[PDB]
Amino acid sequence: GQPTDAELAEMSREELVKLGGKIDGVETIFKEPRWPVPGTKAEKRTERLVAYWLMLGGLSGLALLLVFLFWPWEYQPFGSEGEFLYSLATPLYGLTFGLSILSIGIGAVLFQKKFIPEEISVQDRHDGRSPEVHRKTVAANLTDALEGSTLKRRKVIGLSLGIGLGAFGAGTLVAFIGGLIKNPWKPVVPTAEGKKAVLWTSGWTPRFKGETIYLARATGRPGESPFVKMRPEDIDAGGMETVFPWRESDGDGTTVESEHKLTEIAMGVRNPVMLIRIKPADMHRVIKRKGQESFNFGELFAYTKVCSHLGCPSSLYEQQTYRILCPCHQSQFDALEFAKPIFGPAARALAQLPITIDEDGYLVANGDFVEPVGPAFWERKS
Amino acid sequence: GQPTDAELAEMSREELVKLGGKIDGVETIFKEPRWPVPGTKAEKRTERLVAYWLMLGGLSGLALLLVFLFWPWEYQPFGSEGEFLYSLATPLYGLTFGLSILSIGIGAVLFQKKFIPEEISVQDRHDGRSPEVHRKTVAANLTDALEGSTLKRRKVIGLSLGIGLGAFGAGTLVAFIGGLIKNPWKPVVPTAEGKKAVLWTSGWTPRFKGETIYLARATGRPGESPFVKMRPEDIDAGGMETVFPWRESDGDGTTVESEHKLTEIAMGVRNPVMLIRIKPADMHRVIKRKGQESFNFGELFAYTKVCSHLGCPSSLYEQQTYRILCPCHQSQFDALEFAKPIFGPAARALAQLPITIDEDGYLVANGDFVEPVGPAFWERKS
Amino acid sequence: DFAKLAAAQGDAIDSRYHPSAAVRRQLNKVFPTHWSFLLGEIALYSFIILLLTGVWLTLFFDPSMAHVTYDGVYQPLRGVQMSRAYETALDISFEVRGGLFVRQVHHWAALMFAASIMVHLARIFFTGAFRRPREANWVIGSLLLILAMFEGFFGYSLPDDLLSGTGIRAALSGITMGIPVIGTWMHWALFGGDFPGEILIPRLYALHILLIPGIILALIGAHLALVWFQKHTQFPGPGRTETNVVGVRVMPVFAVKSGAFFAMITGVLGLMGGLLTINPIWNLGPYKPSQVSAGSQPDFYMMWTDGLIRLWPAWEFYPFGHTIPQGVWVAVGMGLVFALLIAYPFIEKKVTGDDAHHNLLQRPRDVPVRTAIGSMAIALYLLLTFACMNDIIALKFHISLNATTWIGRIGMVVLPAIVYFVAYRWAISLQRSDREVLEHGVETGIIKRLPHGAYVELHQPLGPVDEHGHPIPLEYAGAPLPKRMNKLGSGGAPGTGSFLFPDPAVEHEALTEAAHASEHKSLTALKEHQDRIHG
Amino acid sequence: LLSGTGIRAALSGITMGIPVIGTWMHWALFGGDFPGEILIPRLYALHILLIPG
Amino acid sequence: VWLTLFFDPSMAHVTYDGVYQPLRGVQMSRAYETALDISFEVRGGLFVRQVHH
Numbered sequence A, B: 001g002q003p004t005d006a007e008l009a010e011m012s013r014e015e016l017v018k019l020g021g022k023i024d025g026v027e028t029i030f031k032e033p034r035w036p037v038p039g040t041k042a043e044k045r046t047e048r049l050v051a052y053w054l055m056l057g058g059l060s061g062l063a064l065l066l067v068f069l070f071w072p073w074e075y076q077p078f079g080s081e082g083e084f085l086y087s088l089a090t091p092l093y094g095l096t097f098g099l100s101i102l103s104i105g106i107g108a109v110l111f112q113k114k115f116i117p118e119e120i121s122v123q124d125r126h127d128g129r130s131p132e133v134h135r136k137t138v139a140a141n142l143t144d145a146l147e148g149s150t151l152k153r154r155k156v157i158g159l160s161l162g163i164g165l166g167a168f169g170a171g172t173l174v175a176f177i178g179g180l181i182k183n184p185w186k187p188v189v190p191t192a193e194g195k196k197a198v199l200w201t202s203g204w205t206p207r208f209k210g211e212t213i214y215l216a217r218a219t220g221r222p223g224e225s226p227f228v229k230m231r232p233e234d235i236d237a238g239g240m241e242t243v244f245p246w247r248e249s250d251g252d253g254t255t256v257e258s259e260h261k262l263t264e265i266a267m268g269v270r271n272p273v274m275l276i277r278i279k280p281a282d283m284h285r286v287i288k289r290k291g292q293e294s295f296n297f298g299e300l301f302a303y304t305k306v307c308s309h310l311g312c313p314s315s316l317y318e319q320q321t322y323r324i325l326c327p328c329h330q331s332q333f334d335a336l337e338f339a340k341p342i343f344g345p346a347a348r349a350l351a352q353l354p355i356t357i358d359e360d361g362y363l364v365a366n367g368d369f370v371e372p373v374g375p376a377f378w379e380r381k382s
Numbered sequence C: 001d002f003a004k005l006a007a008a009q010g011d012a013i014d015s016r017y018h019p020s021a022a023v024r025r026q027l028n029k030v031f032p033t034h035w036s037f038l039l040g041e042i043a044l045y046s047f048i049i050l051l052l053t054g055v056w057l058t059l060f061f062d063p064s065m066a067h068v069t070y071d072g073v074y075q076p077l078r079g080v081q082m083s084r085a086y087e088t089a090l091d092i093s094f095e096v097r098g099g100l101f102v103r104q105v106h107h108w109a110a111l112m113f114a115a116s117i118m119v120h121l122a123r124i125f126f127t128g129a130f131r132r133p134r135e136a137n138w139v140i141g142s143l144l145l146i147l148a149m150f151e152g153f154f155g156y157s158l159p160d161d162l163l164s165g166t167g168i169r170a171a172l173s174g175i176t177m178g179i180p181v182i183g184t185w186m187h188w189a190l191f192g193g194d195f196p197g198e199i200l201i202p203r204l205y206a207l208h209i210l211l212i213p214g215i216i217l218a219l220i221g222a223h224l225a226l227v228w229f230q231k232h233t234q235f236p237g238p239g240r241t242e243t244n245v246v247g248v249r250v251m252p253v254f255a256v257k258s259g260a261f262f263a264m265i266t267g268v269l270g271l272m273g274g275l276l277t278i279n280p281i282w283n284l285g286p287y288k289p290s291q292v293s294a295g296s297q298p299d300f301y302m303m304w305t306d307g308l309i310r311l312w313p314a315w316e317f318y319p320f321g322h323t324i325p326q327g328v329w330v331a332v333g334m335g336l337v338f339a340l341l342i343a344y345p346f347i348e349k350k351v352t353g354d355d356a357h358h359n360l361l362q363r364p365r366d367v368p369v370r371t372a373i374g375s376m377a378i379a380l381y382l383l384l385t386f387a388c389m390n391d392i393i394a395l396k397f398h399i400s401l402n403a404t405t406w407i408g409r410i411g412m413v414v415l416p417a418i419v420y421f422v423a424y425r426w427a428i429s430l431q432r433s434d435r436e437v438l439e440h441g442v443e444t445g446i447i448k449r450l451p452h453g454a455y456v457e458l459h460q461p462l463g464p465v466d467e468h469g470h471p472i473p474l475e476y477a478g479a480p481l482p483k484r485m486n487k488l489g490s491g492g493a494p495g496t497g498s499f500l501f502p503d504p505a506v507e508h509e510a511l512t513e514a515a516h517a518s519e520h521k522s523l524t525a526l527k528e529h530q531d532r533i534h535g
Numbered sequence D: 001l002l003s004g005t006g007i008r009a010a011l012s013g014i015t016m017g018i019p020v021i022g023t024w025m026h027w028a029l030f031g032g033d034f035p036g037e038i039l040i041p042r043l044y045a046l047h048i049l050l051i052p053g
Numbered sequence E: 001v002w003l004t005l006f007f008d009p010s011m012a013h014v015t016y017d018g019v020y021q022p023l024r025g026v027q028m029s030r031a032y033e034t035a036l037d038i039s040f041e042v043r044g045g046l047f048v049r050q051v052h053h
């Protein structure tokens, strides 16, 4: 029970380790070497095994280096000489790297499990309720700091500090978050009826009364004339086409002024619509919504693609079932009837775009959606 | 010299604090309250002072919240009612916030300096050379861990682990940095003499032999027709104009194919050139460089704007001294002589563009720079 | 019942965990109460404010060179091609409530961070706080200073601006291409191509908001942990020795005053962000290689590197078919500066022989040669900074630009020598003044002797007085000496009533003798502890 | 396409459907309507520094 | 960290004009463009992003 002032000089390594364990509350029981018998060849085999694993790690690391420095990387277009090499370029990087470090780890684990001595050291756990001396002394220190400071006697300081900190906190937090906060109902989008909110307005909202908004088909042409006017004859019974609100002013994408209006049209969340050609045989099964009875042009029905529930496009269309399916959460809308949801999470019918043909027969929206078209929100149905 | 098993119960707060200091090596000397005399009105005055500071902090924090939420913020165009309010909007935010927190801090400091008791606590410093018991026990623990592990006895493992870790580190570092490493001298920029490295080529390098590169002036028009062809008559003696390498193919910015070529022309580091008109009277002081004697078209001299030292534009042209000064590091190049540096960090002359007039009299480059034009680098002057 | 709640929470904490002893150690830790030891806290607090404002800024900043026409609110820049980085910086300035203030306080916090790091470095260097126990602390602090400088560089380079863009073009691109064997390769690796490569600002944004701040946070953690556990050094004083820390405990006084100081530093930075305009990028058009400005300076913490660029005399070497531009000279100069700064404590100990564990600071006067060297280095740094500013100095103060450049060139070898000599002699003369005070006492008003007409200053001895008038000289103990009876027990008892009106005489007397008792009690406690340490 | 569709579903629809403040949270996260020009920069900050910190 | 060294967060529209042929001339954000650059035009970038995910 003494700190060994001069005994440490002659204390051996084992004695010093035991002393350290004792000081730390750790008793090392059965710290025994793995190979007590010397000269055995099983020891040599295990040595060689761990050496082989480490050498495999090193060889695989060198392989990673050489492959990374010298391998036919870089994309190869398709069916091209070198495409096979490219396809397994990255797999080779990962294989070499992972094999190298995994082999190093396996060698380390084997060394621990085969050569490092086995110990069952047990540590004294002093958890919970520090001794009463420590507890009471900490409590005394904190209480002396509090009372000596003379607080909880200067009511004016106690209240003034609280008021000041609270006011500063509130100024600071409001001034932090206020940059982010934006009124979702600031009228910004222009419209024939004056500026309206973004949620109310879409790309189909007539900017000025009587505006022509063609149901332009989005050809995949990379950049130039991405949206092209459309005609009813283009679709055939049981056909679906994704159309967008194209204006004559939003000409082809050749100009810089254009190709920004067109990009806006393409990126409009509420812009894309699906035009469906109801089969004339099944035209008699169509039920129509209140105020949407004349929206369809003959056998053409234009429904918003944006799913009424969370706003994913409802792009999937099943003909001879007339079901507009949404891939995000498997909601089906009965296109025959007004596009009311007959399955899945969606509970509101897809908004129906009024459509018609202008002069020359090109399809044009005959108005705007009589309801907000995206997914629902608090300020809706009024 | 005992842990006070049961005396802590009757030990007072002061005794417990002294005990904690003793245990931690801290002796608190002269811990005395600031106001030993009770009932004095100086104490009340100091109380009110710190209270006033904290309340000023709180009022300023409330002012920050009120001005932030309710003030004419938002940029106001020049010379418009509300410009003054906008200009002193941000100053008011900062004033209120800073005054609030500063006043809270002043109140806290005054409380510490006037009410919190004064102490000269002295702590025993146990720095340096942990007691020999701890040192020798740590050494024994580490040495027992090393030797018991049987390392420094398995030569094959010792070397194999080193090889494996070194190879894995090599491979990993090389694979980490090879993504960043790029060849500066990969021929990428096309040229009449085949693809060449970027540093050699600028916007003035003829893409095909005999290409016409007009010294187009960059009108500040926002986006459309930014670069327009130029004529010698446009400049007058003692005049400088920043010109760019414009091609007929690089037409106005109306199209989308254009306005990317034009953006590239504008953003070319080595593209901009200064065309200076040397006065006819001072034309006799001109000294010309080897291979650049015929570069000047009469009294028109085209020198790269990029400073020969670190590549800042050297735009500060001084007439009646004919000195092209660079603002970045104050280097003057004598325009009269070949644009050699006659002051400042620069040591190489500015590259001189060969200029002439094509059909219709427009200024065009009569070739390419006979030297790399940007700032110098290792692979230069050969 | 807040007291009951606090007691129950303490018991629950001490039952789940056992932090009683550790927390008591932390609370009882004693910190010296010297003002100069708050200089590092200034830098720490500015760093904290930088983090808080940078998070807000990253919530609104978009790093990209993607060209866009502004089409914002700021009329003077409409339809002009600009990078999305510049566009979003303008959006922060104008189209976010308080974004201009947040970015201005962020930049002011960056400037204060650099300045307070410099002041803290000066404090530790001149006081000898880097000696045996703390050379590692000095080293990591030097790395921290370098990281702070470069992070400020990247930070004011983040919003692609004309000024910051031309600064980047000069420093980064030019000096990188200059480096002989790997310069162009470094340039291409960093920019992913030629200078205006379309990854520069995203890379700088990453480095500036995540990578360098992470390293700085780790190094600040190491720094503060080292200061915490290698107990803070202290100046020589009455009860202060190499094996004790005289000051105040963490809990009651030091914690309160450090928190209040942090509040006041935040207030200063907020007031600056409000009242002083910092980096008004809107005046600075978007970066274009052709557009320039006359100023073209970096922040003050890189102004010394820029001034080195300006002043170094255009010496270029041309090996066989190659070039070694003037940028490499400055690159090597910066390398030397950083190497010497990092390795000074080891250089100091190699030169002097000091391998002793030093826990008592040295007065800069008491260490002349080090004080002279530090003064010489500060003079060189100031000369370089004003050389970088020589453009505006020449413009406003009517001095020829060539004259300022050559003043810098000559003075970068003359002014360091002058300042070294002056500082060395000044330190020795401060020592001489201290010894004059020690041997003669403090000075006071003059008196004319009674019999004859001699004039004697009527000094005041600081120690025991010999049987005759002259006192026994005291031994210098490394602590400052009071050279004014002002600061001693003389003329210090104004009526304690108020500014406008008095207080009752009984109250005044009670207060004044209570203060007298308290101060003499403090003096006696310190004297007794000093006597106890050796006696 | 995949991850942006996931964002449109969850972050936009769920956020904007919340009764009292749904649209207000949506507009304050996206700097306006769903395809607001700051969403990915904000997520980049959140994902490399804020949340990992 | 490696990915941040190469990623550019932005919705700023750009035509790819990169190396991946099946997406050339298609309007895309800078975020998508630089993710494609990591995948294709940066050595080991595909591996790094894949091991990251």
Ligand SMILES: CC(C)=CCC/C(C)=C/CC/C(C)=C/CC/C(C)=C/CC/C(C)=C/CC/C(C)=C/CC/C(C)=C/CC/C(C)=C/CC/C(C)=C/CC1=C(C)C(=O)c2ccccc2C1=O
Binding pocket: C383, C386, C387, C388, C389, C390, C392, C393, C396, C397, C399, C403, C404, C405, C407, C408
């Ligand atoms: C590389 C290098 C240092 C080259 C030399 C150029 C240089 C700095 C010359 C000295 C500048 C001076 C002092 C000009 C005045 C004329 C002159 C030389 C008189 C003789 C000097 C002399 C020995 C006088 C004896 C008495 C004495 C010490 C007088 C000093 C007077 C002054 C100016 C003291 C203050 C020092 C000072 C601020 C110098 C200018 C330095 C800088 C970088 C100012 C920056 C600055 C500027 C430039 C603004 O325009 C501004 C506008 C609005 C708000 C803020 C600022 C602002 O902070």
Ligand SMILES: CC(C)=CCC/C(C)=C/CC/C(C)=C/CC/C(C)=C/CC/C(C)=C\CC/C(C)=C/CC/C(C)=C/CC/C(C)=C/CC/C(C)=C/CC1=C(C)C(=O)c2ccccc2C1=O
Binding pocket: C139, C143, C146, C147, C171, C172, C175, C176, C179, C215, C219, C305, C331, C334, C335, C338, C342, C343, C346, C347, C350
């Ligand atoms: C004689 C004697 C007794 C000596 C004592 C021995 C001695 C030195 C003992 C101390 C031992 C040391 C120092 C050990 C290492 C400590 C260490 C690094 C620990 C790790 C720290 C850690 C946790 C993370 C790493 C943090 C980090 C980045 C540390 C290094 C800090 C340093 C020195 C940065 C230097 C940066 C630099 C300028 C490098 C040169 C490379 C060049 C030329 C790049 C090109 C370049 C660029 C890229 C610019 O931006 C620029 C901007 C403005 C002007 C010019 C330039 C410029 O030239």
Ligand SMILES: CC(C)=CCC/C(C)=C\CC/C(C)=C/CC/C(C)=C/CC/C(C)=C/CC/C(C)=C/CC/C(C)=C/CC/C(C)=C/CC/C(C)=C\CC1=C(C)C(=O)c2ccccc2C1=O
Binding pocket: A172, A175, A176, A177, B093, B097, B101, B104, B105, B108, C041, C049, C052, C053, C056, C098, C099, C101, C102, C105, C224, C225, C227, C228, C255, C256, C257, C258, C259, C260, C262, C263, C266
């Ligand atoms: C428009 C807009 C967005 C505006 C807002 C601007 C913006 C974006 C951000 C800034 C806004 C904010 C949030 C401002 C307030 C910042 C803040 C938390 C201030 C706190 C200061 C304050 C209000 C004090 C009130 C007075 C009072 C009662 C003080 C005593 C109680 C307090 C608060 C104690 C705090 C103690 C403190 C500073 C702890 C810091 C923790 C850290 C990081 C390290 C601790 C530490 C320290 C402090 C050492 O000095 C030290 C020295 C040597 C070795 C080790 C250490 C060490 O570990």
Ligand SMILES: CCCCCCCCCCCCCCCC(=O)O[C@H](COC(=O)CCCCCCC[C@@H](C)CCCCCCCCC)COP(=O)(O)O[C@H]1[C@H](O)[C@H](O)[C@H](O)[C@@H](O)[C@@H]1O
Binding pocket: A169, A170, A173, A174, A175, A177, A178, A179, A180, A181, A182, A183, A184, A186, B065, B069, B070, C095, C096, C097
């Ligand atoms: C206790 C604090 C008491 C204060 C309550 C604060 C809430 C009431 C707001 C009062 C101001 C409203 C009227 C005048 C203002 C107005 O009409 O703005 C509106 C938006 O109100 C704003 O200004 C910013 C709102 C402030 C953020 C508040 C943060 C939450 C608070 C309540 C929690 C912290 C308080 C402390 C308690 C927590 C303690 C911690 C435990 C709409 O903006 P908009 O018309 O679209 O323009 C946009 C510009 O605002 C926009 O800043 C700009 O950045 C643009 O993006 C722009 O488009």
Ligand SMILES: CCCCCCCCCCCCCCCC(=O)O[C@H](COC(=O)CCCCCCC[C@@H](C)CCCCCCCCC)COP(=O)(O)O[C@H]1[C@H](O)[C@H](O)[C@H](O)[C@@H](O)[C@@H]1O
Binding pocket: A069, A070, B169, B170, B173, B174, B175, B177, B178, B179, B180, B181, B182, B183, B184, B186, E041, E042, E043
């Ligand atoms: C001990 C390691 C021994 C290996 C030494 C490695 C250095 C020799 C490189 C050998 C490969 C060169 C020939 C084939 C390859 C070739 O021609 O590529 C060149 C560039 O070489 C590369 O590939 C990447 C270079 C590798 C980075 C090495 C990092 C430094 C090392 C030496 C330090 C770590 C080693 C451990 C020691 C430190 C231990 C820590 C204490 C140029 O690229 P480029 O033609 O422009 O195409 C670009 C594509 O490379 C580019 O990756 C791509 O991303 C594009 O951007 C593309 O444009």
Ligand SMILES: CCCCCCCCCCCCCCCC(=O)O[C@H](COC(=O)CCCCCCC[C@@H](C)CCCCCCCCC)COP(=O)(O)O[C@H]1[C@H](O)[C@H](O)[C@H](O)[C@@H](O)[C@@H]1O
Binding pocket: A181, A185, A378, A379, D018, D019, D020, D021, D024, D025, D028
């Ligand atoms: C980061 C952002 C954090 C948020 C901070 C900012 C939040 C600020 C919110 C307060 C701003 C003012 C609200 C504006 C918008 C608003 O909220 O609508 C009001 C609604 O008041 C009512 O009557 C509702 C009560 C009556 C029905 C009883 C319902 C009980 C429900 C709530 C119980 C379910 C709760 C379950 C919680 C589930 C939680 C899920 C996790 C009425 O409309 P109004 O104020 O006139 O606004 C007009 C627009 O309605 C108009 O469409 C437009 O055209 C404009 O004119 C606009 O001005």
Ligand SMILES: CCCCCCCC/C=C\CCCCCCCC(=O)OC[C@H](COP(=O)(O)OCCN)OC(=O)CCCCCCCCCCCCCCC
Binding pocket: C340, C344, C347, C350, C351, C352, C353, C373, C376, C377, C380, C416
């Ligand atoms: C802005 C300003 C520039 C920035 C300034 C910061 C850089 C560090 C400052 C100064 C370093 C030079 C100091 C002066 C060195 C003294 C030379 C000598 O003669 O050595 C005599 C000593 C005393 O010996 P002593 O038994 O006390 O007897 C009394 C005998 N008369 O010997 C020794 O131990 C030491 C022998 C060798 C020491 C080597 C020190 C330099 C190491 C390289 C680091 C770079 C140096 C850069 C220099 C600028």
Ligand code: HEM
Binding pocket: C047, C050, C051, C053, C054, C055, C056, C057, C058, C061, C089, C092, C103, C104, C106, C107, C109, C110, C111, C113, C148, C151, C152, C154, C155, C156, C157, C158, C159, C208, C209, C210, C213, C216, C278, C279, D049
């Ligand atoms: C640690 C020390 C730091 C320093 C010295 C520093 C320095 C700077 C400076 C001087 C600016 C210029 C501001 C302006 O021109 O208006 C800046 C910009 C910026 N900083 Fe830092 N900063 C630091 C930390 C941080 C951190 C931790 C973050 C992120 C949490 C951050 C985020 C930003 C952003 C996003 C910008 C660009 C905003 C803008 O252009 O206005 N900074 N930085």
Ligand code: FES
Binding pocket: A307, A308, A309, A310, A311, A312, A313, A326, A327, A328, A329, A330, A331, A344, A345, A346, D009
């Ligand atoms: S997103 Fe369409 S059903 Fe959910």
Ligand code: FES
Binding pocket: B307, B308, B309, B310, B311, B312, B313, B314, B326, B327, B328, B329, B330, B331, B344, B345, B346, C170
């Ligand atoms: S950048 Fe032009 S002289 Fe240095």
